[PDB]
Structures are given as structure tokens and as C-alpha cells.
Amino acid sequence: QYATLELNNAFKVLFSLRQVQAAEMVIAPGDREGGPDNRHRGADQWLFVVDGAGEAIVDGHTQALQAGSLIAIERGQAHEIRNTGDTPLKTVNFYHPPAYDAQGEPLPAG
Template identity: 55%
Template sequence: MQHRHLQFGHGFRVVLGDDRSQAAQLTLAPAETEGGPDNRHHGADQWLYVVSGTGAAIVEGERVELRDGTLVLIPRGDQHEIRNTGDTPLKTLNLYVPPAYTDAGEELPAGGK
């Protein structure tokens, strides 16, 4: 069993995982964005859960408003961007199936490690 108490700092950080799945936390400051036209995870689905804050997820051109408790599934290969549209940090927990990043936060090629 693995476990971790999450303490959201700034930016993106892989926090837990194994060969089949992975968890990472992301904190964006007000007006900050992550992702964009070149942001796709070719080898992994991404589940994004909003812990706190407000924002928007733009997935394949479709906008979804984000707020505390929102859960979004971003299918593998879909272009996406996450934006903080609020006045406080946007904190998200992101699950990748299978893992999408190395422990250092570098993106894995499709097909894994």
C-alpha cells in the first residue's frame, strides 16, 4: 500500500503511482494556465478533480467550468488546457491511467516507461 498526505504548493508534482496508474497535484495561481495546443497525453487518460478554486478546462475546444468538486475525464490524445479564472489558487488532483509522467515530472512516451 502507498499513501501520501497532499500539501498543495505551486505548480505540478507527481505524488504517487505504480505501473498502472499515477496521481499528481497541480496548483495554478490566478490568471495562470497549463497546457494548450500541444498538450496531449497520447498514452494515458487524465481524470482531473478540483480540490479548490475556480477555472476552466478547454478540451478539444469545448469549455467546462471548474469549481470545488468538479470531476473531468480528459481522454488520451485529447488536446487540453487548464485555466485559473478566479482570485485564489486553483488546486487539482490529477489521476493518469496508465502513468503519463516520470517521478520528476517529465512526460512519458505513449506506452509507458
């Protein structure tokens, strides 16, 4: 499967393969986006930063994010990614197992 990411979508589900799902996520300055938690289907989230700067908030601590950062957040944790810089935070994400339907809505728990 193939796609050319334009990195201009707030959240766009790309495609899945054997229980791994890819998505494009661009966060505007001052914005933040959740992430899979325990409310819907649980999933690990792998996030790679193409550009911009920000932070990942998880369980009670933070991880700074910059161009080139790769973070793997294990399923079962409330978390969010926030753009703390002044330029778009462009990211590519991988969920294991898949966490969303094609429209970007979370899959149901269990």
C-alpha cells in the same frame, strides 16, 4: 501507498499503482497547464478540484470547474486547465496510464 497532499506545488508527481499515476497540481490565477496530448505518451486525465475555480479547455469547447468538480479527459486530446479565478486552483490528478516521470517531465510517446 500513501501521501498527505499539501496542495502548494505547481506540479508534483506522487506515486503510481498498476498503471494509474497521481499528481498534485496547483494553478495560480491567470495561469494554465497543458495536459497529456498526442506529442508524448497518451493518457486519460482525471482531475478533481479541491479549491478554486477555473476551466478545462478540450478539442474546441470548455467545461467550467469549481470546488468539487471531477472531470475525466480521454487520452489523445490536446487540452489545458486554466485558472480563471483570483485564488489558487488546487487540484489532484490521476493519469491512466502513467504520463510523467518522477520529475514531472512527460514520458515518451509509445
